[PDB]
Design an enzyme around this catalytic site. Structure first.
Site, short mmCIF file in Angstrom:
data_model
loop_
_atom_site.label_atom_id
_atom_site.label_comp_id
_atom_site.label_asym_id
_atom_site.label_seq_id
_atom_site.Cartn_x
_atom_site.Cartn_y
_atom_site.Cartn_z
N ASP A 1 0.86 -1.18 0.00
CA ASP A 1 0.00 0.00 0.00
C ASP A 1 0.89 1.22 0.00
O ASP A 1 1.95 1.20 0.63
CB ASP A 1 -0.85 0.04 1.29
N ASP B 1 -2.27 -3.23 -3.49
CA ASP B 1 -3.46 -3.14 -2.60
C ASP B 1 -3.97 -1.65 -2.52
O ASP B 1 -4.40 -1.12 -3.49
CB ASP B 1 -3.06 -3.71 -1.24
N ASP C 1 -4.59 4.10 3.27
CA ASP C 1 -5.46 3.39 4.21
C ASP C 1 -5.29 3.94 5.60
O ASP C 1 -4.19 4.35 5.98
CB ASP C 1 -5.13 1.89 4.22
N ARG D 1 -13.86 1.86 -2.98
CA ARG D 1 -13.40 2.43 -1.72
C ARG D 1 -13.05 3.93 -1.81
O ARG D 1 -11.90 4.36 -1.57
CB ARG D 1 -12.19 1.66 -1.16
#
EC number: 4.2.2.2
Lengths: 444, 444
Positions: free
Chosen positions: A150, A172, A176, A274
């Protein structure tokens, strides 16, 4: 003017490393290579400002030996991308900092490394581009469940401003926020997929496999007469980014209720999912763009019969078309935004639509929406709205713990937002050219 | 040894209102009366810490008019207790809070009110005693199905720590957890019945009826020559608490799978049932005591012929003797505990033993058990064990959704547990005297 660039939202009050002179060498570090970065970001270094001076190639196998030590570590191995198999991939963990600014003057690139921010407060990251952290997934058959790469992960941190950054494809997630991280604002930033140019990152990955098909069983199956995708088809479908922002990574944890994030003046170009995906906490997006035009076009390359053949072998390969997602009693408000070619822009339950425990609260206000040429501007609440939440019984919108948001903010009209955010002085790294001290400031 | 007092179990990660100074008056509220409480606990008040300063008498008819508004409401009417008929009974609903601590410095009492926690996260309730929320049941003939008064009900919430509290008799439940509530720990708490002293709460109720027998048909029948119970017998039999913890209130609801609760270092004295009663989810009890000595003694006052006469008229009046109950595919583990004079300590199916859908999984590990002078120390699972699950075909134990518990914890030996929990610094409210800031902490 420049007040358009003020810090707003849940990261209000964050001053990062402060306004510190570049001559204050004890606490202002100019970083030219991985070793400089390792020394600057070492736990308890006391460094307040890190100025990235040029592009950094931070893979575990390409950095100097002196940099192969905390805060750098080897990440999970590259298995498929011909470049990353050479460079390796690092994980750089920023741990325990309180008041830190990381920036570049002219949009330097951070390549081949994930950044993890842990147990830190008042972190500002600005005017950096993040690239070359994606590769094709054979190991988990399209699920992208192995490498866990990430660009930025925030954990148990408080007050983080990510602004004027650009993010390209990641295995990914892009940014986040996890483990109760509070006070995050991400603004003036670009999140984009691969453009399918003849030497693009994704094209380079596919060309390697095309030349050695038997070594990549999923790719080989997709190209075979069982499915019938062309190499060009696979590049187009692989161009969009699968995952945007995971805000709360573990189901039904109470620490999720402490997550807070503001997204504004960001472009999400060909991001499949997302924007954000929330559990439990509070997320506010205003004046963002979710433009999935190219992903939607790529979906036309996979017919129903092709999709059946792909899934019948247990492979995941296709286009997810989600926008904002609120789950597990979270609260998401999207306002004054533009959404294009996202089929399910507003979702309220991903796990079990008849179990209310998994339903979040979500509302959209005065937002422009288009799907396959349609045209709508309005809210999620009016009868027949294409922004209505699906698929669970709706939990009426309200914030978690307060009646109204604890900050004020300026709203632009969504009808002019695409022009503004995609201009030469729009969202992203390397767009705003002003004296470099301005990157340390939080208002103008 | 203050680390013995750390937050553990499924409520891990809950910090409540945090560490807030008592001088921070916007978010730390000192509560002296019902109006102060109503203002502090109003939805969206933003209050982080509520310090209860003295005992509170919170019945709907005794509180100030200014307190007769949300979050207070009138509860179902008192029908029989002479005190409650005057004071009334309130229901106080804590709704939409994120990060809240309610405590007192010296074990203040909350009387004549039920607390409902709804749609909240990270709630801590400590060092409070709950009392005077029971009355005799004529309306439902001993079933206690009308008033629905419970000291604490948790609904659609996440992260709740109830610790160093004391609970006396309640009409219905003591602490119930419903509608998918997860992340609950109840620790260092006392749950007890009435002691039968000449001015006890139960004795005051019985004295009223003894003076006016015709007005209470069930009581009158029990005292009559059809049954032959004395007033003293009825006070003794009514002294034990009928219901403990209802964890999942509706049969076969999918949200029950999300219930999680930890019970530890609690004393359940003369509690007849539900320690806990679980549907669907996961419950872990360690280092608890279920001591039903006085209830077992009271049972000797009802002979077989007396019991038949009570039941023949449709009345429920007697001593249930249950311990932990797992139903409907739930998982309950009890370990390192002490159980005394509970006839059926381990149950696995209450609704229909011939139907496996109604059976839960349950195991007991290294626990001391005694019934009518017997002595056993061991597990659920060994041949001839008095802790074997009854009455349905046994489902092999496993947790739901995980292999091992998602938290670590230290186990004390059950052989010294009674001495530890009944000591001057044992379980309950008013037991720990340390500086009041310690009530806001979650580790030591």
């Amino acid at each position: 003017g420049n007040a358009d660039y003020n810090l707003t939202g849940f990261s209000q009050g964050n001053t990062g490393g402060g306004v510190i002179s570049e001559s204050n060498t004890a606490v202002y570090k100019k970083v030219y290579n991985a070793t400089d970065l390792a020394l600057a970001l070492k736990k308890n270094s006391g460094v307040k400002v890190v100025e990235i001076m040029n592009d950094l190639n931070l893979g575990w196998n390409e950095i100097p030996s002196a940099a192969q030590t905390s805060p750098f570590a080897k990440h999970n191995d590259a298995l498929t991308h011909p470049v990353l198999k050479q460079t390796g991939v690092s994980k750089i963990t920023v741990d325990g900092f309180n008041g830190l600014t990381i920036f570049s003057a002219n949009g330097s690139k951070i390549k081949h490394a994930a950044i993890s921010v842990k147990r830190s407060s008042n972190v500002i990251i600005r005017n950096l581009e993040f690239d070359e952290l994606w590769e094709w997934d054979e190991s988990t058959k399209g699920d992208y469940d192995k490498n866990d790469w990430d660009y930025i992960t925030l954990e148990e941190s408080s007050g983080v401003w990510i602004d004027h950054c650009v993010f390209n494809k990641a295995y990914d997630g892009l940014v986040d926020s996890k483990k109760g991280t509070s006070g995050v604002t991400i603004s003036w930033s670009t999140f984009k997929g691969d453009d399918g140019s003849p030497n693009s990152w994704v094209t380079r990955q596919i060309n390697e496999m095309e030349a050695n098909k038997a070594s990549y069983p999923m790719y080989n199956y997709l190209r075979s007469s069982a499915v019938g995708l062309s190499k060009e088809d696979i590049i187009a479908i692989s161009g969009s980014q699968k995952k945007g922002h995971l805000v709360g990574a573990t189901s039904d944890e109470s620490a999720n209720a402490n997550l807070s994030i503001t997204l504004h003046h960001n472009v999400y170009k060909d991001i499949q999912d997302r924007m954000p995906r929330l559990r439990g906490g509070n997320a506010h997006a205003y004046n963002i763009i979710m433009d999935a035009t190219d992903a939607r076009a790529a979906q036309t390359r996979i017919t129903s019969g092709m999709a059946a053949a792909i899934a019948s072998k247990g492979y995941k390969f296709g286009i997810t078309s989600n926008g904002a997602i609120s789950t597990e009693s979270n609260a998401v408000l999207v306002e004054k935004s533009v959404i294009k070619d996202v089929q399910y822009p507003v979702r309220n339950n991903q796990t079990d639509p008849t179990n209310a425990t998994y339903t979040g609260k979500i509302r959209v206000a005065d937002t422009i929406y288009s799907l396959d040429g349609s045209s709508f501007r309005g809210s999620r609440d009016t009868a027949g709205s294409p922004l209505a939440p699906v698929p669970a019984a709706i939990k009426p919108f309200s914030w978690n713990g307060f009646s109204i948001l604890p900050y004020s903010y300026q709203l632009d009209d969504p009808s002019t937002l695409n022009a503004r955010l995609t201009a030469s002085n729009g969202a992203g790294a390397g767009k705003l050219s002003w004296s470099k001290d301005n990157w340390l400031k939080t208002s103008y």
